[PDB]
Amino acid sequence: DRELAILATAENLLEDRPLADISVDDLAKGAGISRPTFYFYFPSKEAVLLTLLDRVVNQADMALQTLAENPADTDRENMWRTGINVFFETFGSHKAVTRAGQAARATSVEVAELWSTFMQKWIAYTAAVIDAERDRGAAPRTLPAHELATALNLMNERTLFASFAGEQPSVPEARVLDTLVHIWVTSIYGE
C-alpha cells in the first residue's frame, strides 16, 4: 500500500535520473511518508531497486511459464518469436527498472545473484527446448544445446538492453525482435 507507493515513486524517478541521483528523502516525499516511515518498509534505496527488478524478472518468468504450458499453434519461427517477445514486452515496459537493475549488477551482490539465477533458468529452458527439437528430428545436433542457449541468451540481454537504452551502437527498438528471431532460428535449425 505505502509499500506500492514507494515502488511506484522509485520507478517514476528512475525515468528521469539514475539511482545515485535519488535520495531516500526523494522516495519518502514521493510516496507522501516521512524518511523514518520509509525505513520501516525498506532498509535502503538499493533494496527498492532490488524489489522492482525482482517483480519485473518474476513477471517475465511467469509469462514464459504460461507460454511453455500453452504453446502457440504456428511455425517454429513464430513460436520462438512469441518466446523472445515475453522479454521484449516485459522489460520494454519497465525500461527504467531494467536499465538501473543492469547498472546495479556491478555494485550489488543481490542484484547480480538475482539476475544470474534467472539467466541460468532461462538458458536451461532454452536448451531443453533445443534438445526436444533435436529429439523430434526438427533441428540438427550441431553445438552443445546448453552452450548455444547461453550465447543466444547473452546476445538477447545485451541487444535488448542496448536498444531500450538507445545506445550507440544498437538495433532500433522496432527492428530488434525480428533481428533476434532470425539469429535464433538460423543458429538453431542450420548446420
Q: Which residues bind a copy of itself (CB under 8 A)?
A: 103, 106, 116, 119-120, 123, 142-144, 147-148, 150-155, 157-159, 162, 167-171, 175-176, 178-180, 182-183, 186-187, 189-191
Nearby residues of 4 by Cβ (< 8 Å), 6 or more positions away: none
**Phi and psi at residue 171, to the nearest 5°:** -75, 135
The nearest distance, CB 47 to a copy of itself, in angstroms, is 20
Could you say whether residue 153 binds ligand GJ2 (CB under 6 A)? Answer: yes
Could you say whether residue 26 binds ligand GJ2 (CB under 6 A)? Answer: no
The nearest distance, CB 49 to a copy of itself, in angstroms, is 14
145 within 8 A of 134, measured Cβ to Cβ: yes
The nearest distance, CB 152 to a copy of itself, in angstroms, is 7
When the beta carbons of 6 and 84 are compared against a copy of itself, the nearer one is 84
- Specify the stretch interacting with ligand GJ2 by CB under 6 A; choose among 12-20, 33-41, 150-158, 166-174: 150-158
How far apart CA 121 and CA 128 sit, in angstroms, is 11
Q: Which residue in 91, 93, 116 sits closest to 104, CA to CA?
A: 116
First to last CA, the chain: 54
Residue nearest to ligand GJ2 (CB): 83
Could you say whether residue 13 binds ligand GJ2 (CB under 6 A)? Answer: no
- Specify the stretch interacting with ligand GJ2 by CB under 6 A; choose among 18-26, 29-37, 78-86, 170-178: 78-86
**Phi and psi at residue 74, to the nearest 5°:** -165, 180
What nine digits make up the cell of 27? 522516495
97 within 8 A of 11, measured Cβ to Cβ: yes
The nearest distance, CB 132 to ligand GJ2, in angstroms, is 7
Residue 38 interacts with, from a copy of itself, ligand GJ2, none (CB under 5-8 Å by kind)? none
CB atoms within 10 A of CB 10: 24
